[model samples]
Target chain A: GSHCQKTSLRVNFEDIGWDSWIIAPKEYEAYECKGGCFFPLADDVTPTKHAIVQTLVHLKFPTKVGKACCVPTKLSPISVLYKDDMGVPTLKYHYEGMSVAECGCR
Target chain B: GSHCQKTSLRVNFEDIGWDSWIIAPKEYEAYECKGGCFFPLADDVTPTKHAIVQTLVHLKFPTKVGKACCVPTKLSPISVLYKDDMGVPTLKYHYEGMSVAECGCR
Candidate 1:
């Protein structure tokens, strides 16, 4: 029973040396896509046409082609509270595609 | 010499019965990503961290994991000239992610 799903990953801005600028929300939950895209994909997978074909082709010729990969299909933005150049507290959305909202085999 | 590259695909609106509504550029060049992302991927294929790891894992366990796929990493929008409900000629961008601009293993 293989499946692709979203996995939780916490990212601390401070861990990446951003604590000096990021005053609020020192840590946030980021996510990653994991698992397998085995044959007879589960109904929840909702794979694309290319993924289906690639999976079949890989099964037939494993050495010639690779299998579909589980990756982020949809991403959401995150709002961050940080200090600007002037050290002023500012609120804005950072990284338009930083938060993974959906996962699928691609 | 396996590589992921942009391949040409002429999309004829007429073939899809869109000629009636799409007046200009009856056909447009819609590209697709084709080829393989073999080991030590050609310098051209800047694969993501996930792809690199997946490739290695699949090689060790072909049945347990699948290989990377060559897909459009970046897509451009396409403008289409079509008729409106009132039979008025209208020009607007169709699918924003229809034109494949770059290909990479994912």
Candidate 2:
């Protein structure tokens, strides 16, 4: 949610062929930080953080990758750390842990 | 910086073959929201949000993909909106706009 999470996102670079990818410190902004700097990376992030960033960047979507920051369309994790509409910390992935974006779910 | 950017990341899903994907409201959360939503999708995002999501998911990097939220490794946009160390609203992409994450830059 903040910082480009270089470590985390790097994994996807290969999926789209960004293996050598390293978002320039001046370039990464999804998390509001740069050069693999996060908050946890606040300076940067959690490892999972970078994973998402890299996943989406090299990713091929369409007009989504334009003058603005690039973005991704799906979330592969069966679980993730997220706040709901009410703004409460919830974890289906952090705790619940499903197996893939499969079947409508439990 | 918020929302999974359903409109944004889905493009990459196809890159890895996720076009049939849709985070299914119960799934998407990086921006703290889900299901083709934004604040602009801010309910979720700016379109770029989700683009980054799908980009990393199908994108095959390394262990970067895990139990938590998966992240992307690189940012393709030459320019992106980012807040610096003090959190100032600066414009490089909104204003500077580069081309491809090309040669070290201006």
- lDDT of all the models against the reference? 0.68, 0.29
Report the error of model 1 at residue A50, Å: 12
lDDT of 2 by residue, A2-96 (tens): 33422223222234433333222212212211232222323212333323432344344434332122222223333344455676645544322
Model 1 misplaced stretches (Cα beyond 4 Å)? A1-71, A74-101, A104-106, B93-95
Judged by lDDT, which candidate is best? 1
Please give the distance, in angstroms, between residue B27's alpha carbon in candidate 2 and its true position after superposition. 14
Each candidate's root-mean-square deviation in Å? 9.5, 22.1
TM-score of each: 0.53, 0.17
lDDT of 1 at A28: 69
Please give, for residues A1-106, the per-residue lDDT of candidate 1 as tens digits. 7588877655666554557777878776656677888776977676764455456556665775566667767767777788889888899766455566788876
In model 2, the number of clashes is 77
Error of 1 at A76 (Å): 12
Q: Which residue runs does candidate 2 get wrong by more than 4 Å?
A: A1-32, A36-45, A49-63, A66-106, B1-8, B11-14, B17-106
Q: Model 1, range B4-56, lDDT digits (tens) per residue?
A: 88777555665545587779887776666778777768776777644554465
lDDT of 2: 0.29
